[PDB]
Amino acid sequence: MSKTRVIYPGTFDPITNGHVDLVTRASRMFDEVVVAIAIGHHKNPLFSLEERVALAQSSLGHLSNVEFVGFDGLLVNFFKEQKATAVLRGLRAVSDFEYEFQLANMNRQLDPHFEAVFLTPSEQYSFISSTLIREIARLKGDVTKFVPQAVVEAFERKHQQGW
Ligand SMILES: CC(C)(COP(=O)(O)OP(=O)(O)OC[C@H]1O[C@@H](n2cnc3c(N)ncnc32)[C@H](O)[C@@H]1OP(=O)(O)O)[C@@H](O)C(=O)NCCC(=O)NCCS
């Protein structure tokens, strides 16, 4: 009867309705869910860590078993420090299934306790990529159908500088 705690890592740059669906499904099946935002120092996210955490808190903060934290370093060290039972990842028709096996199997070799669980989002999110959403917003299209309203406003406010 001990508690389950799953980590859901990603760059969440920005959070999308697909991610929302996923976390909502995970929060129904596990006792605690950690939205783990990889800081992305060598990798350059469009939105800062503070913006990405805050956008995630506004979409998901009404679920009381979901926490929000930024991390860097190795996923397996974070997993250990957090006392996690597993890491969750999203699998979609558009997923690199073989890349997920690779991450799961390498991380198990770094830490034999590591465990990975996969959820599959509602089919209507099956085809949304964060890359395409950034590209649509960058070319001034409308992203309302793909992301929460707070993210739509964040793209205007990003645009209210040069962008
Ligand atoms: C952070 C980490 C989990 C990477 O996960 P990932 O599979 O690349 O997915 P992301 O972290 O990129 O999170 C969402 C992203 O996936 C895609 N994505 C996945 N599910 C999505 C959804 N439901 N809706 C929209 N986009 C989605 C997007 O294109 C987006 O990528 P982008 O912003 O880089 O374009 C992994 O890099 C990591 O663990 N890093 C820490 C370092 C480490 O331990 N490395 C060694 C492991 S052996």
Ligand 1 centroid to Cα of residue 124, in Å, is 20
Report CA Rg, the chain: 16
Q: In Å, what is the CA distance from 152 to each residue of 31, 50, 100?
A: 30, 16, 29
For this entry, resolution in Å reads: 2.0
Instruction: Look up residue 43 and give its amino acid.
Output: K
Q: Rounded distance, CA 86 to CA 90, Å? A: 13
Name the burial class of residue 55, with classes exposed (0-12), middle (13-18) and buried (19+) by CB atoms within 10 angstroms of its CB. buried
Of all protein residues, the one whose alpha carbon is nearest to atom 35 of ligand 1 is: 131
Name the burial class of residue 81, with classes exposed (0-12), middle (13-18) and buried (19+) by CB atoms within 10 angstroms of its CB. exposed
**Which experimental method was this entry solved with?**
X-ray
Q: In Å, what is the CA distance from 48 to each residue of 32, 70, 104, 152?
A: 25, 11, 27, 16
Give the pocket of ligand 1 (CB within 6 Å): 9-11, 13, 16, 18-19, 38, 74-75, 90, 103, 106-107, 121, 125, 128-131
Would you list the domain boundaries of the chain? 1-163
Q: What's the CATH number of domain 1-163, 3.30.70.330, 1.10.10.60, 3.40.50.12280, 3.40.50.620?
A: 3.40.50.620
Q: In Å, what is the CA distance from 145 to each residue of 28, 148, 149?
A: 24, 8, 9
Q: What are phi and psi of 9, to 5 degrees?
A: -85, 155
